[PDB]
Design a protein around this motif. Sequence first.
Motif, PDB file in Angstrom:
ATOM      1  N   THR A  12       0.847  -1.175   0.000  1.00  0.00           N
ATOM      2  CA  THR A  12       0.000   0.000   0.000  1.00  0.00           C
ATOM      3  C   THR A  12       0.894   1.240   0.000  1.00  0.00           C
ATOM      4  O   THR A  12       1.288   1.693   1.050  1.00  0.00           O
ATOM      5  N   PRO A  13       1.308   1.779  -1.175  1.00  0.00           N
ATOM      6  CA  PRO A  13       2.267   2.887  -1.211  1.00  0.00           C
ATOM      7  C   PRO A  13       1.737   4.145  -0.563  1.00  0.00           C
ATOM      8  O   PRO A  13       0.569   4.488  -0.750  1.00  0.00           O
ATOM      9  N   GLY A  14       2.630   4.837   0.166  1.00  0.00           N
ATOM     10  CA  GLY A  14       2.319   6.166   0.656  1.00  0.00           C
ATOM     11  C   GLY A  14       1.386   6.095   1.856  1.00  0.00           C
ATOM     12  O   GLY A  14       0.814   7.108   2.241  1.00  0.00           O
ATOM     13  N   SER A  15       1.216   4.885   2.408  1.00  0.00           N
ATOM     14  CA  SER A  15       0.275   4.665   3.494  1.00  0.00           C
ATOM     15  C   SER A  15       0.986   4.812   4.839  1.00  0.00           C
ATOM     16  O   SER A  15       2.210   4.975   4.912  1.00  0.00           O
ATOM     17  N   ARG A  16       0.211   4.719   5.917  1.00  0.00           N
ATOM     18  CA  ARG A  16       0.792   4.676   7.244  1.00  0.00           C
ATOM     19  C   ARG A  16       0.513   3.335   7.913  1.00  0.00           C
ATOM     20  O   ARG A  16      -0.245   2.506   7.406  1.00  0.00           O
ATOM     21  N   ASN A  17       1.159   3.147   9.056  1.00  0.00           N
ATOM     22  CA  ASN A  17       1.089   1.951   9.886  1.00  0.00           C
ATOM     23  C   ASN A  17       0.917   2.415  11.344  1.00  0.00           C
ATOM     24  O   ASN A  17       1.718   2.144  12.210  1.00  0.00           O
TER      25      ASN A  17
END
Length: 129
Positions: free
Chosen positions: A69-74
């Motif tokens: 999931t590019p550009g996502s957060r965790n």
Amino acid sequence: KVFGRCELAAAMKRHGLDNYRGYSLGNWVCAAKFESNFNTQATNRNTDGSTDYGILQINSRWWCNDGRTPGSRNLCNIPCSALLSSDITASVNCAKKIVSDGNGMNAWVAWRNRCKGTDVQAWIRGCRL
Ligand code: NA
């Protein structure tokens, strides 16, 4: 793992969701019913390329890392796969962060559209709690 209704209600209660941020247990059970059908292994792709994982369909866009999931957060600091376990600990702890982030249970589309404003106590009727 596919939970029974009362089984999941009991597990959620044990893990501290009953009235968490003021949402009664029936809200949480209702949400899980319509997000996952009580199946911890549920996964669903979103249009933006993120994926929703587990009983509460937690979204890789913000909350977990699934490696694609590019550009996502965790923000829950977990692999998304942890949300699929038979043990709901990771899903519950992450849901507590989500529901605290200002929008309450409106973060869950299914809750908003199918549980909010209904008689959610019905979801825990008959359960030994
Ligand atoms: Na992510």
